[PDB]
Amino acid sequence: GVEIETISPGDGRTFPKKGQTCVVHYTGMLQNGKKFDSSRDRNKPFKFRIGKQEVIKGFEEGAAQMSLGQRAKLTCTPDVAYGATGHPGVIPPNATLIFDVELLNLE
């Protein structure tokens, strides 16, 4: 249960697969509008692999649906991202997460 809204189109032909690392700049904000994470702020592109359950499920599904060079907005329901426990001190319980993600490169 992740909705993808294309802020900017990508090449549209290349999609993430098995075992291929995704390099993305993402900006995550709560549904009220408050920002909690930004890899662009850290100036380090985030790297992760599909299918290893290292990232949250909403982010993983959104990146899988994404295409190379595409910029899109990801809306993650509480169940698909952090559940009801929440992230201690960062994400309140039962919070919807909105991400602005750009698929920079695939390695």
Partner 1 sequence: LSKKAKASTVDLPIESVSLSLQDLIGYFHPPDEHLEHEDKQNRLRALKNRQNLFQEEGMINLVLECIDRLHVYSSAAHFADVAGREAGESWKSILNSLYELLAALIRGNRKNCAQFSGSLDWLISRLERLEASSGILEVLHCVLVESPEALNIIKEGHIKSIISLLDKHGRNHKVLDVLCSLCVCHGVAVRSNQHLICDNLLPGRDLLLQTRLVNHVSSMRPNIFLGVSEGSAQYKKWYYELMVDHTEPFVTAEATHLRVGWASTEGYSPYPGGGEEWGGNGVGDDLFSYGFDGLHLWSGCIARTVSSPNQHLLRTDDVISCCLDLSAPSISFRINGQPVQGMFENFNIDGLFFPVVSFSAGIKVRFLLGGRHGEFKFLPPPGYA
Partner 2 sequence: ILELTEQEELLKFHYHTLRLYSAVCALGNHRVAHALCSHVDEPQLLYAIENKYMPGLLRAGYYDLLIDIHLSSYATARLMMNNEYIVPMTEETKSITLFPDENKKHGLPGIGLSTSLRPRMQFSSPSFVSISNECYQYSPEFPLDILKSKTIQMLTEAVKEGSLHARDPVGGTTEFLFVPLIKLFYTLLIMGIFHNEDLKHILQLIEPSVFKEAPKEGLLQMKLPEPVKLQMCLLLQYLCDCQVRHRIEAIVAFS
Of the pair 12, 21, the CB lying nearest partner 2 is at: 21
Residue 6 touches partner 1, criterion: CB under 8 A: yes
Residue 90 touches partner 1, criterion: CB under 8 A: yes
Q: Are 64 and 10 in contact (CB under 8 A)?
A: no
Q: How many of the other CB atoms lie within 10 Å of CB of 1?
A: 12
Give Rg (Cα) of the chain. 13
Q: How many of the other CB atoms lie within 10 Å of CB of 69?
A: 15
**Which residues contact partner 2 by CB under 8 A?**
26, 28, 36-39, 41-44, 46, 48, 53-56, 59, 87-91, 99
Of the pair 26, 78, the CB lying nearest partner 2 is at: 26
Nearest to 79 by CA among 68, 100, 103, 95: 95
**Token pair for residue 14?**
């290349």
Provide, rounded to whole angstroms, the least separation between the CB of residue 13 and partner 2: 26
Interaction residues for partner 1, span 39-78 (CB under 8 A): 40-41, 71
Task: Show which residues are catalytic.
Answer: 26, 36-37, 56, 82, 99
